[PDB]
């Protein structure tokens, strides 16, 4: 807990220390990364992670709708361009679609969202809903967990292909290459947090908002663990079929 | 799937069939009902279920804010009176607090919401956010899962006191009695569904909405399973203390 307002520098260090809770320390992430995960588990990860990615532009658009500052909006929309693709070219979403096919899932499998677990949906939807309601500074700042991402790993040829030979190399490589080409300022979140949180009370609240964001990523992986690692998907005691809801009910009729 | 529009009485039977997916069929509920749950699992269940219970009034008020029909609102508001108490009298929320005391938790433990798991929080908040955005008819109809609740928590000595004699008898009896006195019309959502859902398209959508409501309840028990039955609470690889966010960010500063 903070009593005396931290300085921009020490506040940056309180923010970065939340990195210890990043989802890379989740066992499901670790099993995947070590080559220990099964085919079902990989495919389930890609299909559920896909839901988080197709929601990010809705979430960025929500922030912009709450942002009366044109200069901020000019930087922020690059996040939407990134995912959706612009100038008639392909974007991040197309990268994730290429990974799906590389791991053996079809375009329609991913796009339909049919394999997305309720637990994943609720966590991801919490992110969107926070961005719809919170002030734009607070919602924008929550994007700074992106600073905890790996080294953009490539000194690892012994990492995925190697570990999972059944994954098609063409697709995987298109995925890694579309993503290393992002144009969004991954730092904007931190710069904004440093400028905006200029009192003890805001700084403490921002650390809680960061915690919320981390709780979302971790909770996505809990849901995957239950379903694909522990044999306990929703309703397993009553049916062997997938029976969870499959619709973004508030945004689409059917 | 529904092909051609079902009659009201036949549509009712399709809604009732979804009770096969009610949360009483979840392993965590079964273990509690069977006498095999631990004290930590029971305490964790009361604390997390209490987050759901304190949210119901907010969700019912969100329905009312979207309902321009006075006649509906006069029935709906009794749900709020049931939960919060009226004319000085106590209400269902006080019954849950007594249940918490009865299983060994303090009122501050419950009221503070500090033990609520993020996975429970995200599922419960998805309910409130659906009610805030969906048309009032669709949001109201989801309350019909209350029809699936068994004989209002009562059986010939098979219960909780014989399996868990450490449960305090005063609190427990206050809980069972105080909940039996609710005045809300639990059928209201089912009567509105039969009147409102008068096409195949509405019927199928309503079935998906009920499924969404069922997925909430199941997903709350998944998160409790992960924390209290499988020793995998959030961040268990990095810390043994509780580090999840504990604040309803969009409704309270701290």
Write out the DSSP string of A14-63: HHHHGGGGSGGGSHHHHHHHTT---HHHHHHHHHHHHHHHHHHHHHHHHH
Task: Give chain B's radius of gyration (CA, Å).
Answer: 19
Resolution in A: 2.1
Which two tokens mark A206? Answer: 């921002």
Any A CB within 8 A of B118 CB: yes
Cβ contact (<8 Å) for B208 and A246? yes
Name the residue among B248, B233, B243 with its Cα closest to residue B119: B233
A11: enclosing H helix or E strand: helix A8-17
Contacts for B163-172: CB closer than 8 Å, 24+ residues apart: B163/B34, B163/B35, B164/B35, B164/B39, B164/B42, B166/B39, B166/B104, B167/B102, B167/B103, B168/B101, B168/B102, B168/B103, B169/B102, B170/B98, B170/B102, B171/B98, B171/B99, B171/B100, B171/B101, B171/B102, B171/B103, B172/B98, B172/B99, B172/B102
Nearest-Cα distance to chain A for B93, in Å, is 25
Any A CB within 8 A of B242 CB: no
8 Å CB contact between A145 and A56: no
Q: Is A53 exposed, middle or buried (0-12, 13-18, 19+ CB in 10 A)?
A: middle
> What is the Cα–Cα distance from A200 to B230, expressed in whole angstroms?
37
* A&B contacts, CB < 8 Å: 139
> What is the Cα–Cα distance from B124 to A177, expressed in whole angstroms?
38
Cβ contact (<8 Å) for B234 and A247? no
8 Å CB contact between B147 and B19: yes
> What is the Cα–Cα distance from B107 to B89, expressed in whole angstroms?
18
Give the position of tokens 């053996």.
A104
Query: CA angle B35-B173-B79, nearest 5°?
Result: 105
> What is the Cα–Cα distance from A209 to A144, expressed in whole angstroms?
11
Count how many Cα atoms sit within 13 Å of the Cα of residue A22 in the half-sphere of its side chain: 16
> What is the Cα–Cα distance from A254 to A145, expressed in whole angstroms?
33
> What is the Cα–Cα distance from A219 to B25, expressed in whole angstroms?
23
| Residue B153: count of CB within 10 angstroms of its CB | 12
The structure was resolved experimentally with X-ray
Task: Give chain A's radius of gyration (CA, Å).
Answer: 19
Integer CA distances (angstroms), A174 to A119, A216, B54, B98, in order = 29, 28, 48, 58
Cβ contact (<8 Å) for B118 and A215? yes
Name the residue among B156, B125, B108, B135 with its Cα closest to residue B58: B125
Give the position of tokens 């209201």.
B188
8 Å CB contact between B103 and B46: yes
**A12 in helix, strand or coil?**
helix
CATH dotted code for B1-254: 1.20.910.10
Name the residue among A128, A116, A125, A124 with its Cα closest to residue A234: A116
Task: Please name the residue of chain A whose CA is at the shortest distance from the CA of residue B210.
Answer: A245
8 Å CB contact between B10 and B201: no
> What is the Cα–Cα distance from B62 to B131, expressed in whole angstroms?
6
What are the φ and ψ backbone dihedral angles of B50, each rounded to 5 degrees?
A: -60, -30
**B129 in helix, strand or coil?**
helix
Which two tokens mark A37? Answer: 């995960």
> What is the Cα–Cα distance from B63 to B129, expressed in whole angstroms?
10
Q: Is A68 exposed, middle or buried (0-12, 13-18, 19+ CB in 10 A)?
A: exposed
Q: List chain B residues with CB under 8 Å of A219.
A: 118-119, 122, 223, 234
8 Å CB contact between B182 and B82: yes
HEC letters along B85-125? CCCCCCCHHHHHHHHHHHCCCCHHHHHCCCCCCHHHHHHHH
Q: List chain B residues with CB under 8 Å of A62.
A: none
Task: Please name the residue of chain A whose CA is at the shortest distance from the CA of residue B224.
Answer: A222
Q: Is A81 exposed, middle or buried (0-12, 13-18, 19+ CB in 10 A)?
A: middle
DSSP B5: P
> What is the Cα–Cα distance from A201 to B254, expressed in whole angstroms?
9
Count how many Cα atoms sit within 13 Å of the Cα of residue B45 in the half-sphere of its side chain: 23
What are the φ and ψ backbone dihedral angles of A214, each rounded to 5 degrees?
A: -70, -35
> CA A225: distance to chain centroid?
17
Task: Please name the residue of chain A whose CA is at the shortest distance from the CA of residue B232.
Answer: A222
Name the residue among A62, A20, A1 with its Cα closest to residue A207: A1
> What is the Cα–Cα distance from B34 to B31, expressed in whole angstroms?
5
**B183 in helix, strand or coil?**
coil
Name the residue among B205, B199, B63, B235 with its Cα closest to residue A250: B205
Cβ contact (<8 Å) for A223 and B222? yes
Give the position of tokens 């809770």.
A21
8 Å CB contact between A109 and A195: no
What are the φ and ψ backbone dihedral angles of B246, each rounded to 5 degrees?
A: -130, 20
Q: Dihedral (C-alpha) A101, A107, A113, A117: value to the nearest 10 degrees?
A: -20
Nearest-Cα distance to chain B for A209, in Å, is 7
Query: CA angle A43-A46-A51, nearest 5°?
Result: 130
8 Å CB contact between B165 and B106: no
Integer CA distances (angstroms), A45 to A29, A115, B45, in order = 9, 10, 28
DSSP A113: -
> What is the Cα–Cα distance from B137 to B49, expressed in whole angstroms?
25
């Amino acid at each position: 807990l903070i009593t005396d307002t931290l300085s921009p520098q020490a506040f940056e260090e309180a923010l970065r220390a939340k990195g210890d809770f990043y989802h890379i320390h989740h066992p499901y992430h670790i099993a995947m990364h070590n080559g220990d995960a099964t085919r079902k588990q990989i495919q389930g990860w890609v299909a559920n992670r896909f839901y988080y990615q197709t929601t990010i532009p809705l979430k960025d658009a929500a922030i912009m709708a709450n942002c009366p500052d044109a200069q901020t909006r000019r930087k922020w929309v690059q996040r939407i361009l990134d995912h959706d693709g612009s100038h008639g070219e392909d974007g991040g979403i197309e990268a994730w679609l290429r990974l799906g096919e590389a791991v053996g899932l079809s375009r329609d499998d991913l796009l339909s969202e049919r394999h997305v677990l309720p637990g994943v949906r609720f966590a991801v939807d919490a992110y969107l809903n926070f961005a719809r309601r919170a002030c734009w500074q607070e919602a924008a700042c929550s994007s700074l967990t992106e600073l905890f991402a790996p080294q953009i790993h490539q000194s690892r040829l012994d990492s995925w292909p190697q570990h999972y030979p059944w994954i098609k190399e063409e697709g995987y490589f298109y995925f890694r290459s579309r993503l290393s080409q992002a144009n969004r300022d991954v730092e904007h979140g931190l710069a904004l947090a440093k400028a905006y949180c200029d009192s003890a009370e805001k700084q403490n609240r921002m650390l809680e908002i960061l915690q919320f964001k981390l709780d979302i990523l971790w909770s996505m992986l809990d849901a995957m663990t239950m379903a694909y690692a522990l044999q306990r998907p929703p309703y397993h005691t009553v049916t062997d079929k997938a029976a969870w809801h499959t619709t973004r009910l508030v945004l689409e009729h059917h």
